[PDB]
Design a protein around this ligand. Structure first.
Ligand code: HEB
Length: 218
């Protein structure tokens, strides 16, 4: 199965990849694509000819249409990804921006106790040097996930509860960047055996400029 979510599905949408083009696009992987179109896989975008790799993040254009980009991050070595897409010049104007995660949930199991910490990074209008970073604390007995990540401008924190059977987590979120606080929502999933990684999104209806994708490894 494939688990994922996207903050705005008007233009892009996520799920299992659907396009087979020898040597570039492969079906059956974690993927993204035009709303109304077919999904391609991140595995083929990462390290491809349109990929621009900076500080652990992939930024890829499209062969097909200029002036829109995906910045995304792989969780460990799993087929699990989080990032954003936008239209515009690049690093510059983030029009119609949307944040997402999607992963293959094959083999995912969730502990029933006790505690673990995750290295987390986040994506919000990424331009090379501004990835978010920090730690999440999971308590598998209490079924809680909480933590925060930040860059120099923005801080996002999550407070979520864990559904161990589906490996989902769901709760609130808070953004600070900068001086002012905005309350929002958090959602995502654990991925991999023993919840080896996680990915999710933090969204803020009152200011979508704050919406942030995040993920990392235990
Ligand atoms: C980057 C790099 C790249 C490259 C090289 C490519 C190359 C290619 N490709 Fe691609 N794609 C892509 C990137 C890409 N691509 C993307 C990103 C997508 C999604 C959408 C957009 O545009 O964004 C796709 C998508 C896609 C699709 C789907 C569409 C719809 O909407 O439905 C198809 C069919 C294809 C094909 C193809 C081909 C045939 C080729 C060659 C030959 N593609």
């Amino acid at each position: 199965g494939f688990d994922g979510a996207i903050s705005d599905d008007s233009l892009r949408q996520v799920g299992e990849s659907e396009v087979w083009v020898p040597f570039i696009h492969s079906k059956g992987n974690a993927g993204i694509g035009k709303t109304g179109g077919k999904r391609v896989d991140f595995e083929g975008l990462a390290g491809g000819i349109f990929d621009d790799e900076r500080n652990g993040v992939h930024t890829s254009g499209s062969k097909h249409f200029q002036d829109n980009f995906y910045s995304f991050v792989q969780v460990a070595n799993q087929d699990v990804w989080f990032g954003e897409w936008y239209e515009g010049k690049k690093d510059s104007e983030f029009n119609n921006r949307t944040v997402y995660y999607v992963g293959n949930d094959a083999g995912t199991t969730v502990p029933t106790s006790g505690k673990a910490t995750y290295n987390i990074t986040g994506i919000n209008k990424f331009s090379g040097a501004n990835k978010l970073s920090g730690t999440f604390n999971a308590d598998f007995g209490a079924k809680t996930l909480d933590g925060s990540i930040n860059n120099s401008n923005l801080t996002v924190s999550v407070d979520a509860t864990i559904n161990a059977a589906t490996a989902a987590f769901n709760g609130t979120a808070q953004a600070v960047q900068n001086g002012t606080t905005t309350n929002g929502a958090s959602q995502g999933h654990f991925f991999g055996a023993n919840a080896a990684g996680l990915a999710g999104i933090a969204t803020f209806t009152n200011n979508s400029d704050l919406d942030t994708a995040f993920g990392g490894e235990k």
